[PDB]
């Protein structure tokens, strides 16, 4: 019977603005959508899609609402089907080693859901790409845009696409007739980092009656 009355919902933190995407971003880049001061509407997450694969790395999935944190770093990427479990801190792989890696101390949670129809089409959408190699393993939370042809030999090919001189992007081979292991899911992640700030992003609270 305790009174928990609070002011109005204020301004929705725009998330579905990101999740309800017309076209998501390739892993080659990141949406990196910064969400500023508002009420962290994380609560509304179950109504994404059937078989929403969710699993966190430091915050209670359900009691996340009350834990107000400082800021949020939100980015998205569609990924090759089976590679969902590649997105995990301290787990090496293909994408996790040359596309995007989560630091071990990443307190946030990982959200993934199947895409299928929206992404995959019978004609084939080769728009999305992914990295093929690099001079060295990327530092975590870093963005690579260079389209430089690799130097696998003792000789810099400069601008000729040659033996041991490779191009760093191949497309997401996405045909709807592909298997569940190959079906494109949509994997996003939300950073819950701590800083020196008044924690301008908190979950909303319910209210009682008069």
């Amino acid at each position, epitope marked *: 019977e305790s009174i928990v009355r609070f002011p109005n919902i204020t301004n929705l933190c725009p998330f579905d603005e990101v999740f309800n995407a017309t076209r998501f971003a390739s892993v080659y880049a990141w949406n990196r959508k910064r969400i500023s001061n508002c009420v962290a509407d994380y609560s509304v997450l179950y109504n994404l899609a059937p078989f929403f694969t969710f699993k966190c790395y430091g915050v209670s999935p359900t009691k996340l609402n009350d834990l107000c944190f400082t800021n949020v770093y939100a980015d998205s990427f569609v990924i090759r089907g089976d590679e969902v479990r590649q997105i995990a801190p301290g787990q090496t792989g293909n994408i996790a080693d040359y596309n995007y890696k989560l630091p071990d101390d990443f307190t946030g949670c990982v959200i993934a859901w199947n895409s299928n129809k929206l992404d995959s089409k019978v004609s084939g959408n080769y728009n999305y790409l992914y990295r093929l190699f690099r001079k060295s393993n990327l530092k975590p939370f870093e963005r690579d845009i260079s389209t430089e042809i690799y130097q696998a*030999g003792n000789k810099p090919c400069n601008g000729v696409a040659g033996f041991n001189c490779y191009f760093p992007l191949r497309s997401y081979s996405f045909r709807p007739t592909y298997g569940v292991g190959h079906q494109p899911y949509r994997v996003v992640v939300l950073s819950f980092e701590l800083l020196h700030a008044p924690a301008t992003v908190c979950g909303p609270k319910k209210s009682t009656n008069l």
Partner: antibody, heavy 123, light 110 residues
């Protein structure tokens, strides 16, 4: 160096399509490259193609381009080569030749080569 | 189109004596995308040249052939039993098709 295991020889009828298996023992072709080359007894190493295995981008020598196909098998790290429209004189040795690829650099020029597979079209 | 023709392959040569293997081509090509391979019969060839001379791992200064543009050669300073083998020059430039050479019969002068 290390030796790449290669599939056993067989004999086939004319007009068939042959799949010959070449797989490195402990060398996954992460960003490596390879493809096959053919000789008959005492003749030239007739080139076939090359693929960036990590990629899948192909080149088919514009000679048997309509009858030669290649795909890889990353899961077990095997490269493949199908030669359709097998006619008489294709009876010849097959070699799969790859360069060593350290994940950061490859020694320019294919050095790690396969065992050698015999293929006979004749009856 | 690339037609790279090799030297008068049929080399009847006495031990220790010098040899030269020209790999004249039909077109101008960078002097790095060509290598030489040595084959004992009944087994695949082996890598000898990496770029310019670039004597291969294990293979000493004995094989230091050169060339540029359309001219490319391989030189042998001495002769050892392993030297008596098929020699192959091959082009591997760019995404373009890799050209191969006919061969060279390095044998003993009798």
């Amino acid at each position: 160096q290390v030796q790449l295991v290669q599939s056993g020889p067989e004999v086939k009828k004319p007009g068939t399509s042959v799949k010959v298996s070449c797989k490195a023992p402990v060398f996954t072709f992460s960003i490596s490259a390879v493809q096959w080359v053919r000789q008959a007894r005492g003749q030239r190493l007739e080139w076939i193609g090359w693929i960036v295995v990590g990629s899948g981008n192909t080149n088919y020598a514009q000679n048997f381009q309509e009858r030669v196909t290649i795909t890889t098998d990353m899961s077990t790290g095997t490269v493949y080569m199908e030669l359709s429209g097998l006619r008489s004189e294709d009876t010849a040795m097959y070699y799969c030749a790859a360069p060593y690829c350290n994940r950061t650099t490859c020694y320019d020029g294919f050095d790690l080569w396969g065992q050698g597979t015999m293929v006979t079209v004749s009856s | 189109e690339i037609v790279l023709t090799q030297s008068p392959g049929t080399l009847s040569l006495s031990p220790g004596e010098r040899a030269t293997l020209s790999c004249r081509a039909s077109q101008s090509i960078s002097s790095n995308y060509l290598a030489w391979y040595q084959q004992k019969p009944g087994q695949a060839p082996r890598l000898l040249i990496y770029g310019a001379s670039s004597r291969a791992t294990g293979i000493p200064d004995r094989f230091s052939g050169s060339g540029s543009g359309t001219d490319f050669t391989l030189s042998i300073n001495r002769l050892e039993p392993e030297d008596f083998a098929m020699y192959y020059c091959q082009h591997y430039g760019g995404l373009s098709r890799w050209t191969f050479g006919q061969g060279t019969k390095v044998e003993i002068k009798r």
